[PDB]
Amino acid sequence: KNPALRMKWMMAMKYPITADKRIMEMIPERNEQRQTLWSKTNDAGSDRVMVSPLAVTWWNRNGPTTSTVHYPKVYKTYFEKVERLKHGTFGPVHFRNVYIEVLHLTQGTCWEQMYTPGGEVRNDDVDQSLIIAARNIVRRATVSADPLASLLEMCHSTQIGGVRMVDILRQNPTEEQAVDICKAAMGLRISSSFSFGGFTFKRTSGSSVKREEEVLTGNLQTLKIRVHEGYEEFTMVGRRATAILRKATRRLIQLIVSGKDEQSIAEAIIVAMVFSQEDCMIKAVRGDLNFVNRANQRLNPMHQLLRHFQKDAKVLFQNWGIEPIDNVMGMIGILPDMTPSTEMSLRGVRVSKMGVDEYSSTERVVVSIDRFLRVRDQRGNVLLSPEEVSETQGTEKLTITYSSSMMWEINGPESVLVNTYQWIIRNWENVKIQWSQDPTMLYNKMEFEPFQSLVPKAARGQYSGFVRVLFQQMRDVLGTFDTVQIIKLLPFAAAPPEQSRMQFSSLTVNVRGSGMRIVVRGNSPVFNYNKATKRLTVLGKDAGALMEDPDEGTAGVESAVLRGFLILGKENKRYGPALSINELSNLAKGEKANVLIGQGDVVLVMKRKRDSSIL
Amino acid sequence: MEDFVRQCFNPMIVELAEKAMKEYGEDPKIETNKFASICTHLEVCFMYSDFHFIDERGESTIIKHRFEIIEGRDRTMAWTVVNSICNTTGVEKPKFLPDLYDYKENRFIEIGVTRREVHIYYLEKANKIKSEKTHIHIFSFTGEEMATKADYTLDEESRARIKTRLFTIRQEMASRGLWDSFRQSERGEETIEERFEITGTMRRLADQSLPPNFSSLENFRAYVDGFEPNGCIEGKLSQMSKEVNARIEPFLRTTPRPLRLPDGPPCSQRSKFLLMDALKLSIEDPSHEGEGIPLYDAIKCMKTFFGWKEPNIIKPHEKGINPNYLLTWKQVLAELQDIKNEEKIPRTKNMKKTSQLKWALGENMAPEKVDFEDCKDVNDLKQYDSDEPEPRSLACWIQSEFNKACELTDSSWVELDEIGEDVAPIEHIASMRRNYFTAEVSHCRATEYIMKGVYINTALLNASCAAMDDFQLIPMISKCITKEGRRKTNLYGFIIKGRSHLRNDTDVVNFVSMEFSLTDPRLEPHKWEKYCVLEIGDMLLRTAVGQVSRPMFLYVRTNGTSKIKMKWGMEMRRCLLQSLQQIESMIEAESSVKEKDLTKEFFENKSETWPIGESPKGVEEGSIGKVCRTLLAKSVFNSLYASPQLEGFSAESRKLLLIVQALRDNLEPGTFDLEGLYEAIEECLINDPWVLLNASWFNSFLTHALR
Amino acid sequence: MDVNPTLLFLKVPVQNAISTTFPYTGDPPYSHGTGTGYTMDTVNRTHKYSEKGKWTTNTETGAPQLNPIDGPLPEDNEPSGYAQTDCVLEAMAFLEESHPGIFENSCLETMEIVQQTRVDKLTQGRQTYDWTLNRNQPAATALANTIEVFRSNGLTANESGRLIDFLKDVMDSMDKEEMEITTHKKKQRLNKRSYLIRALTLNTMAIATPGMQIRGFVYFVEALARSICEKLEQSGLPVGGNEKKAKLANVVRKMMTNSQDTELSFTITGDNTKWNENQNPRMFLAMITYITRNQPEWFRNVLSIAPIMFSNKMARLGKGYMFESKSMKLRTQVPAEMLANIDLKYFNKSTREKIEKIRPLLIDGTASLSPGMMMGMFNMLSTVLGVSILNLGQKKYTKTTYWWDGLQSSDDFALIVNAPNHEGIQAGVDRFYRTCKLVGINMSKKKSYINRTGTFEFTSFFYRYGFVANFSMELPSFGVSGINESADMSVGVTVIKNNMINNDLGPATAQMALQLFIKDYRYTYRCHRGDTQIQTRRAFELGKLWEQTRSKAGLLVSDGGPNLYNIRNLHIPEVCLKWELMDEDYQGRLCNPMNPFVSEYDAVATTHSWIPK
């Protein structure tokens, strides 16, 4: 309490700072504006003079510079924190309830949020960038109108680190679920092994045939499955869990899995159980399974069962049964409570130390692509799909750009604004023609969907109505075109407008919580236009360049600033003194005034005699 | 010296050492050698318990950690871990806190490092601690190592590594030229016999501090030392009175009754400013010369009105000075005109001392100071009137006050700065919740009240602490942003503070506040008892039959505020945080049962109905928006009406709510003393209107839920 | 149609919306509960609950004393301060039996800290009574004055710097017949009785603050009590938030799941309001002597000095009273030193009755209060007693079909009782009530309720079907601490982070706290973002910086740059958070060691860190 008020009041005076006397003979006696940067008074009880924080800012902005040495080496503690945070990743958050400085994120009131910090380890820049880009593209395309064509458009309309991603895809042998799905959609060759349950399944012995079986679940729900009959030998490959599995006709006989931690081993074991197509787990199904992705589209029953088991499997472990175990070198058991045991283990699931690892394969196959990106090989088994794509997201060692129409809402609201205006400026000719001819379709363009999110819901229909009326006036008046205004104001009209009487002098866009304001007339921090250089700046980030179209009024009048009114340029003292925007509601048709639009400039305006209508 | 330890030792070990010494309350700056000693001890313990694991068969494998650290944690965690280990393995409970625990050997090991010879340290440690089945690991910087029974759990490689670490550390101290101090600081902690004798006064006091039937402390010590329980509790309970018992009253649905409300004259407004009846003289967009200064803004806002009349009193202050309020209002207007006549107007203008100003403030009505010796012989000299205020009946105007406080305004009252981007999904959920709530409540009247109070209180405090002996004038300004997006500046009235020579935080400054309004105070005069009402103009308002003229009233009232109350009113922004916390807690409570982030369907769904009111046809629901606005309004009302009565009633009624809840879930509840709880709750319903309305809400909820 | 927030509970279970019922969530502005009449009523009630206790006259302070221990057993449900020594000792013995060695380990692990603490440890703490000046004073200045006076009086052993040495110095000074106080030159001679009464004072602006001669002994006894509690499971101290949340769930799981389906379980939540009336320092001394059985005598004396001294505690009486005459419009104030002999016509009926009750105790303007305790000095010992009472509820001790357990933290208590039938539950609750009454533990029947197991609360940790709703903390100040730009930023961001970690602060609420933080910081230091249109003198040069920098995000918030903090990134220092983004020239200028401005919290030694004039 006391310190805050004391500092607030102390900073008020002109010279609240105390500094050594040397500053007298090192910095100018005042500023370029003649402001004094010090005072001759000496601190009580010492020889230090009194100066002002303006001197602090002067030193910060144009003070003498020195070499930055001993700083990176001395601060060895917080730098590692920065590296771990930035190079770390994240994951799905579950509402149920290295790791010594992230406590708030990992644990909360009643939810858990996974996080794996970084450091300087792991794979290279190109592979990680490709994996993350493919993950984002696939995840967004999951919810598109048609994932296949949309995904192709995103892949062909994006690049990685200044290099088109198609070249990397064709010249990079990196393997990943998202990358493999993108390659399959592109029609190239993908790995024979099929990514299921988050791990790569590679067959290396045995075979089976597909049969359609109807099975009654433990919850009294009948599901149709494509059960495989015949001995098969699979290897589950994963970074933190590698396993070797045998399967037979509706029977699991052996599974040896090695993982760094118990969680990965448990995940691999659950994946093996679900892949085994055992009747016992069918009888162990509880509840109604309707798992869907962000697109709410129903998935195949196997994926739903896998998700249900991943949610929890405590009620299933004890149902398998009890069998004996033999003590062997490099052999570990699996208790029902998920704990290794020397004397006992869970049925048909063992744990080894080294496991099956090391050598990989370089085999590729020709595959076909179905409606919703579900990659299926010639045999019939599902190879890949977005349902099996991991949720991990990290950082990009090199800049990655996404010019598509649905990747904009990734870099942030500022990025959304900048990219919407970039799209508007890049398509200036076509957008102008559409606005002139059939603007109704333009106002329904999906490319403006992100902007509708930034504009508050409570004040988006009224904003849209104001914009529609203003643009109708601009169209029906003629002779007063102004491209900058059109680009600035177009995106706000997307909503289904409604009639209103407000005369908006500024519209609000929510960026990073704080709401910025863009003025209908003149320049705004959100939208700046420099006519001296003819450049548009959006929040300090360039958005493109504007070229004046074959319509313009270079002699005053501007009809798209005040609804129902036409501004006639410079003010005239002869007419009625400066009015108020609210008062303008009483002027008669054709009346003129000297309204004060804003800032410190007066503009003469005449009330439109006609009336511009909208749908 | 500590710089070397900080730079060499890894951050985690130094952080653990800092926490450990903070637990014992020892400052590292004063004690330097012990800092290095503790850091080395922790380092050697961790190395002893590093890169060691136990395989699933039982054999020792080097890559379930073989060694578990017990001294690397705090006392509570270490004690819990050792208790659990002993209970599970049935091992003899250690006397002290061991440094490490070996799982393969299932035994507790202690680590010791000394500057002097190892043998003396081992001997003293064994004599002090070792009594049965205990092992100590002893090392030193001299390169000589030994342990108990010549048994080392660590292999040759680990022992050599620890020896090399100690040797390189010793070489570092030798190079730095401070190893001599390190060695000399060690002395073995000579444990000379400690004597603490109670004698003289303390012996008498101790002898006079024993239970009955005891003559001296020594007799009691001997008695307790030889004490062994034998059925004393059972005997006392058998001989205890049967009437003593905590009986459970069967709590059914019919038992509860509504709280008995007090009877008497209706309540009255006591807020620092009007809430439902405030009036604003506003400028849509301040672009005039000299912006930012509250005085110029107030002058400009005043110039927008031309309906001034000759002031006259409609509803007078019954127990107060009516004419002087009028005189001081006239003085305010004349002083403003005089300021208008000036050219070089300073930042603020102090009103000249006048009779009416002093009388309205209360300076001339303030009792003087004199010692009790010179005023004892006074016929009516009594203790301050610490008498319980008279009961006041519930009045409907507070209900309307809250109703209008919960309505939706048409301006952006609160402006908040920016933060970083959100990358984690939990960050996305948090941003979504915050943005939804903010969009909901940013247009509520509660935010208007918050900003008005903050501005008034900050200006008043700055004026009070700026000029001590000046009766300054302070406009009541509030800056907002309309829906259209124009910076509106509203002026509600004026305040004049008294003398502000403040030395204590609780010192009371007296001010006189004049507030505009358009409510006729002859409709509910009882609501207005502390105010003097003047009619200082007429306003033209547009209605379906043109511009009708209605009177413009002014409420003048003398109030007092303390610096701590000023800060409390300057920190009302926390009402938004509290209201969020409430809605977020409800979100989490409803989500946990369903086990999924439910904010998306909580806010956007617009299919939920939370009972938030009542109507003639029955109860009424609303939206999550209505819920958020109601909670924020309740928080602001609680902040403005801060009184012990409110907290008392809330605390005593929360228990009744909980018991009713338990009744709803068929938990078969019971009450030991229901009437006592009822009396405790009703003790807080005497005169306050806010608490009375809360009690009325509680009675409505009681009569509705049990149906 | 008319707002009614309470009606929310008509569909939402109350436990979910409990925050609705916390009106303040802060420090109110009135400070109701401190004065003189409150002390009068406290003393009167303390001596009333010991009505039948034996009366005696003290020999050193020359004041009466009341001893209710072993008095007649209560016959009515009203509060009783008749705590039996034998029952307390039996309860402690049973606690030791169920937890063997606990007292032994506590003693042997605390002897070192008893022999290790330095004198400066007493500097940390709350306000202290300065016998030299006879008024509440900061601990540090009180210590300085005490050492100065003792040095003047030839008691300089405390110069060794050991806390035990200073305690011995205090013992010697108290043994002296009289001492001198030199204030600045005014000399005051305090006799043996005067000094003794001063040293046993309890000032009242932890409502009560003892003097300085009793700080170290209180600290030692509280350290032992904390050490004993640590080994105790039912004890609610000194754990934090997560462990406290887990305690309720663990207790419920233990009591319910293990129980048979036939058995019925119930839970009672109770508040031990006015918890210090019925607990006497003599019973605490008895339990302390029992704890240190077969231990070195010096340690026993050091540990037993505290309750011995407190049993003769003297309570000060507020600042006084204020009288006013409306007829003559006059105001006057009278001190408490003149309250012993003064007319009772000035006061009202209740106040004059209280004065009549407390008249025969005021010694030298300071009442004598042997029985009862004062808030917030021996809380851990009270928790120890409560956990002993709880431990006396096992199936082996009860020797009955029913049984019980629960938690106690000395301010709230919860008890789960289960039995084969409803009559069994009634018998269990009644037996617990009587047993806790015998020891002097008082359960308020007007603020306690019983319901089927699953839903209850403890220390505001409301529990419903495995869900805890911790509401035991208030929101701190998110403002400028007033040191410097980097210092304030670092301390405040660390504050919000720490509150998030433990105090159970929601993420969105943390985000708004950071928002208000940025607002207040920019307003106070006048360092606004370059893009913003706000105007001030500092905005001029600041503006220049905004133009010069090639990376806006690199600039520090104090320098006008954007605030990139968020939930994910809060622990990192602000300077380190923008290290790479900062332009090379800006980095060199900012952290120049040769700057003229420079001759806990985690921050970098930038030029923004200066000492205010």
Author numbering:
A (entry chain F): 41 to 137, 227 to 744
B (entry chain D): 1 to 63, 73 to 716
C (entry chain E): 1 to 184, 207 to 227, 240 to 633, 656 to 669
Lines quoted from the article behind this entry:
In the nucleus of the infected cell, influenza polymerase (FluPol) uses the viral genomic RNA (vRNA) as template to perform synthesis of either capped and polyadenylated viral mRNA (transcription), or unmodified anti-genomic copies (complementary or cRNA), which then serve as the template for vRNA synthesis (replication). ANP32 is required for both vRNA to cRNA and cRNA to vRNA replication. ANP32 comprises a folded, N-terminal leucine-rich repeat (LRR) domain followed by a Glu-, Asp-rich intrinsically disordered region known as the low complexity acidic region (LCAR). First, it stabilises the formation of the replication complex, an asymmetric FluPol dimer comprising a replicase, which is part of a parental RNP and synthesises the genome copy and an encapsidase, a newly synthesised apo-FluPol, which binds the 5’ end of the nascent RNA replicate to nucleate formation of a progeny RNP.
To characterise structurally the FluA asymmetric replication complex, without interference from the competing symmetric dimer, we therefore used in the following analysis the monomeric FluPolA/H7N9-4M mutant, bearing the PA/E349K, PA/R490I, PB1/K577G and PB2/G74R mutations. To characterise structurally the FluA asymmetric replication complex we analysed complexes of apo-FluPolA/H7N9-4M with hANP32A by cryo-EM. Consistent with the biochemical and biophysical analysis, a small fraction of particles corresponds to the FluA replication complex, comprising a replicase and an encapsidase bridged by hANP32A. The overall map resolution is limited by the flexibility between the replicase and hANP32A-encapsidase moieties as well as the presence of a preferred orientation. To alleviate this, a smaller number of particles were selected to equilibrate the distribution of orientations, giving a final map of the FluA replication complex at 3.25 Å resolution. The FluA replication complex comprises the asymmetric replicase-encapsidase dimer with bound hANP32A. Both replicase (related domains will be annotated with (R)) and encapsidase (related domains will be annotated with (E)) have the conserved polymerase core, comprising PA C-terminal domain (PA-C), PB1 subunit and PB2 N-terminal domain (PB2-N), but with differently disposed peripheral domains (PA-ENDO and PB2-C). The interface between the replicase and the encapsidase buries a solvent accessible surface of around 3300 Å2, with three main zones of contact. Binding of the hANP32A LRR domain to the FluA replication complex buries ~3300 Å2 of solvent accessible surface of which 80 % is with the encapsidase. The PB2-627(R) domain behaves as a rigid-body part of the encapsidase in focussed cryo-EM refinement, which is explained by its interfaces with PB2-NLS(E) and PA-C(E) domains. The particular juxtaposition of the PB2-627(R) domain with the PB2/627-NLS(E) double domain is a key feature that distinguishes both the FluA and FluB replication complexes from the previously described FluC replication complex.
